[PDB]
Amino acid sequence: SSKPKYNPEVEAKLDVARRLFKRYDKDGSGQLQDDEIAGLLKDTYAEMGMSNFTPTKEDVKIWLQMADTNSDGSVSLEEYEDLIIKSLQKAGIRVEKQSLVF
Numbered sequence: 468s469s470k471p472k473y474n475p476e477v478e479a480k481l482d483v484a485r486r487l488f489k490r491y492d493k494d495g496s497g498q499l500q501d502d503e504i505a506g507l508l509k510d511t512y513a514e515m516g517m518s519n520f521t522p523t524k525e526d527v528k529i530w531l532q533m534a535d536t537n538s539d540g541s542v543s544l545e546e547y548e549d550l551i552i553k554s555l556q557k558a559g560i561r562v563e564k565q566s567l568v569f
Contacts, residue, residue: 471565480555481548487511488544498541501527 473481487510491503499507504527509519522530534542534550542550552562 472563474561474563476560477552477555477562480551480560483514484511484548484551485544488547498543499547501531501540504531504542
């Protein structure tokens with residue numbers, strides 16, 4: 468019903484990641500399979516001026532487990548952005564999410 472409250476510095480990075488998602492999602496399925504992720508990293512890496520290494524079905528697997536919460540070989544829009552959140556924390560971006568006491 469209600470969504471959390473993230474800082475303006477967080478969404479700022481989540482926006483650029485949103486376009487990159489659909490940029491590869493041609494099937495419009497809303498999930499980046501091990502294949503769709505193969506080339507995705509190549510671009511996602513360019514964001515940091517990286518060499519844009521070309522991994523394989525194996526490497527992509529270890530990367531999928533990080534983003535994907537179900538590790539079902541599919542990273543949803545919400546499952547992908549999160550991957551950048553963990554990095555944004557160390558990158559120098561303050562983020563806050565609605566967390567209550569269990």
